[PDB]
Each structure stands twice: as structure tokens, then as C-alpha cells.
């Protein structure tokens, strides 16, 4: 969208002319915003859009945005390197990956496990799986190795694949920026 590109940068370059705004923002926030202008012109769109979107660990295979490129993966690599788009990387959080996984995929994961009633409603299987976390007595059959949850997240990431998310820091600081701009 041109409007997404047209506005955001305009919002910043009008909030720029206010000495109070810099008086209320520290040097670190200023440096992040300087990095943000420093970002490539065509690389602006991926942070511009997903910011104006739902916050969740979501896979790139779902993304379809092509007005930049169909293989704009290197732009995401740049964003990850600069520190906006956290990739798969630190994904060890059972709840998050279970939300990431799809319902048929959840059914399949239930099938390869031996849960009870492996056919229900989306979240019900999720807390049924989290019930398996109450453990570390049976995985101690032989070696201790309590990473039952590690096994589940490994097989889920294999089932799911890649995904990304925005770091809280930037999101928060530009939320502050646009809310000061609004003042309503």
C-alpha cells in the first residue's frame, strides 16, 4: 500500500518538529528511530504492515504480500539482523507454538501421541497437551531427561516450520510515538 508507506513516515517526520517530543524520549529510542530511517526504502513495508496488525507468532507461509517481492526473505534477514523481526530462533515456549500450529496439524500431532479423545475443539486439545507438562516422573523411566516439552516443541516446529514476531521494544516505542501524535 502507498498509504501505509505515505503516512507512517509522514507521521514521524512531523512528530520530528517538536522539542518536547525529544525531551520526552531518551537517546536509545532516538537511536532506534534513526536505525528505522536507515532501513532500506523497500524494506520499510514489512515493518509498516505487520505493526498495523495482530501480534502473534505467525508463519511466513501464510504471508502473501508481494508488492515488494515474492522472495523478500533477504529483507527479513536484514530486519532480524537489525533487531525488529525475531525469527524462529528463541521459540521455546510451548503455548506460543501450540497457538502457531493449525487445528488439523494439532489433530495429527494428537494422533502420533496417545492422548485421550484425540478429536475435539481447538483450544481443548491445547490444554490437553499442556496437561502432559505435568510429568517428570515417567520420562524418568530410564534417564531423567525431562524434556518431554522439548520433544513436543521439536515435533511442533517440524510440523509448523518457520515463523517470526516483532520485539516488544520497538512496538512499544512507536506505539508511544503515534499515540503522542494522536493526542485523543
Amino acid at each position: 500500500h502507498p498509504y501505509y508507506l505515505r503516512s507512517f513516515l509522514v507521521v514521524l517526520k512531523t512528530v520530528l518538529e517538536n522539542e518536547d517530543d525529544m525531551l520526552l524520549f531518551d537517546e536509545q529510542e532516538k537511536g532506534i528511530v534513526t536505525k528505522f530511517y536507515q532501513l532500506s526504502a523497500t524494506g520499510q513495508k514489512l515493518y509498516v504492515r505487520l505493526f498495523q496488525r495482530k501480534l502473534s507468532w505467525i508463519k511466513m507461509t501464510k504471508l502473501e504480500y508481494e508488492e515488494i517481492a515474492l522472495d523478500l526473505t533477504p529483507v527479513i534477514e536484514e530486519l532480524t539482523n537489525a533487531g525488529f523481526l525475531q525469527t524462529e530462533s528463541e521459540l521455546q515456549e510451548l503455548s506460543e507454538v501450540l497457538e502457531l500450529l493449525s487445528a488439523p496439524e494439532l489433530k495429527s500431532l494428537a494422533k502420533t501421541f496417545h492422548l485421550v479423545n484425540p478429536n475435539g475443539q481447538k483450544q481443548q486439545l491445547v490444554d490437553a497437551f499442556l496437561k502432559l507438562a505435568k510429568q517428570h516422573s515417567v520420562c524418568t523411566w530410564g534417564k531423567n531427561k525431562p524434556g518431554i516439552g522439548a520433544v513436543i516443541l521439536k515435533r511442533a516446529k517440524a510440523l509448523a516450520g518457520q515463523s517470526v514476531r516483532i520485539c516488544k521494544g520497538p512496538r512499544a516505542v512507536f506505539s508511544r510515538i503515534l499515540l503522542l501524535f494522536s493526542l485523543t
Binding site: 502420533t112 496417545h114 485421550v116 502432559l132 523411566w141 518431554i148
Partner: protein, 261 residues
């Protein structure tokens, strides 16, 4: 060079069915003395052990100890393509990732050859603590499969009370509660009818029926199952595969506070 010629292919055919749904991947530990399978299920609650000896094999040759990672589902698909009277000629080449299954038609007119790919899993050397069992039960395989299938409808948990007058299986559910008990066979000399119980101290434990149904898929392997159990030890279900080996299962009793929470 691994080369095994097994006359009774049905014996190998049955084994895969018992393992097909309970385990997906496992290490096929092989030695010069026979085959040895040992792994865990996905839910990491039950232990399966197989002790196929080398004597039963018609032709056995194991130059070096090997371990091949094989997809159990994949093996079942290939195995179901061989008849219940063929002569299996499982034969493996040194570090070739090729399991040369050869099915020998007893009619001696059909030649069947397949090759399957070998995965690379990891070994965990599961320690098996040998430890005696207070209550020992042997009783014909079908009724055990019958009993564990019947109590599936009524409930999900079973209380097994090894009573000296006879083992009693009880389950409780929202449909009600029901207890099934047997009586020790005294005069019937048929080995496929005895319900002999060995008593050392009375015991009562609890197990999830979803796994007991899984275990008994290997009823065609043998006529009699042997159950050994005691205080605070996992359940062991034992099958005797003729005279070439035994197939034992391990089931940890459900923790008494699991239903409390």
C-alpha cells in the same frame, strides 16, 4: 554381512502389527546371538522389549554388531505385501542403508524383492531393572483381550486386585461400575485354559486402558499371556513367541494422585 533366512514369515508379520501403532521409530539392535528390539512410545510411558533369539532362524549370520534405524510404519507397509506362508530372507549389507527384504514363495514360482531406506535415529540404552514380582498370573490370551476390550466401554481406569481366590478386574465410569473376576482352573490340563495365579502378597494398582488395548494387539503371537506385578513396579505383560523369543511390555501404574488432580 547380515543374512537371515526365516521359514515362518507370519511370525515376523505378526510382530510388526503389534509394534505398528504403538511405536513409529525404533533402533533395530542386532547381534551375533539374535535380534533385540527395545524402545519407548511417543508419550514416553511404556517400554517394549523383544528377545528374538538366533536358534529359531533357519540361517543366521552376523559378522559384526549393527544398528539400523527403520521406520516401523514403512516396514509394516512392506511386510503386509508378503503372504502368511512365505520364507523371509531378510538380508542387510554392511553400512549400505539398504534392507533387502526377499519374499520366497513356497510355490517356488514367484520371486519377490524389495528394498527400503534406513533412517538414522539415536540410542538411549534404556536400563531394565530386574526385580521380582509378588503376584504372577498366566491365563489364556483371548480372554485377556476380551476382558480389556469389554472394560473399555464402561471406564478408562482399571483396578486389578490380585486376590488369592482369583484376579478381579474392576472399572468405574459415568455409565456405572463393573467387576470381572476369574477362578483358578484346577483339572483342565489344557495349557490354553489354565488361569493359574501365583500369590505372594495381595496387590491393587491402576492402569490406563488406552494402553492395555494397544498391548494386546499381539494375541495371535501366542495362546497364553503372563502378567507379573507387585507394589510400586510397572506392569509387565509377557508373550511367548514359540521357542525363538518373547515379547514383554512394560506399563507404569497410574500415579494415585493423578485422578485427584
Amino acid at each position: 554381512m547380515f543374512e537371515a533366512r526365516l521359514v515362518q514369515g507370519s511370525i515376523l508379520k505378526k510382530v510388526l502389527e503389534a509394534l505398528k501403532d504403538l511405536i513409529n521409530e525404533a533402533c533395530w539392535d542386532i547381534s551375533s546371538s539374535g535380534v533385540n528390539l527395545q524402545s519407548m512410545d511417543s508419550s514416553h510411558v511404556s517400554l517394549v522389549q523383544l528377545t528374538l533369539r538366533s536358534e529359531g532362524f533357519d540361517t543366521y549370520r552376523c559378522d559384526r554388531n549393527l544398528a539400523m534405524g527403520v521406520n516401523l510404519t514403512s516396514m509394516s507397509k512392506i511386510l503386509k505385501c508378503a503372504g502368511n506362508e512365505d520364507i523371509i530372507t531378510l538380508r542387510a549389507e554392511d553400512n549400505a542403508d539398504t534392507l533387502a527384504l526377499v519374499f520366497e514363495a513356497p510355490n517356488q514360482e514367484k520371486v519377490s524383492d524389495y528394498e527400503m531406506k534406513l533412517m538414522d535415529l539415536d540410542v538411549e540404552q534404556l536400563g531394565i531393572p530386574e526385580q521380582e514380582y509378588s503376584c504372577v498370573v498366566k491365563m489364556p490370551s483371548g480372554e485377556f483381550a476380551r476382558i480389556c476390550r469389554d472394560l473399555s466401554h464402561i471406564g478408562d481406569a482399571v483396578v486389578i486386585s490380585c486376590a488369592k481366590d482369583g484376579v478381579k478386574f474392576s472399572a468405574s465410569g459415568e455409565l456405572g461400575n463393573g467387576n470381572i473376576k476369574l477362578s483358578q482352573t484346577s483339572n483342565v490340563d489344557k495349557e490354553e485354559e489354565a488361569v493359574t495365579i501365583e500369590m505372594n502378597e495381595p496387590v491393587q494398582l491402576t492402569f490406563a486402558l488406552r494402553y492395555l488395548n494397544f498391548f494386546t494387539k499381539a494375541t495371535p503371537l501366542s495362546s497364553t499371556v503372563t502378567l507379573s506385578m507387585s507394589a510400586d513396579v510397572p506392569l509387565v505383560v509377557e508373550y511367548k513367541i514359540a521357542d525363538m523369543g518373547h515379547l514383554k511390555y512394560y506399563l507404569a501404574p497410574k500415579i494415585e494422585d493423578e485422578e485427584g488432580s
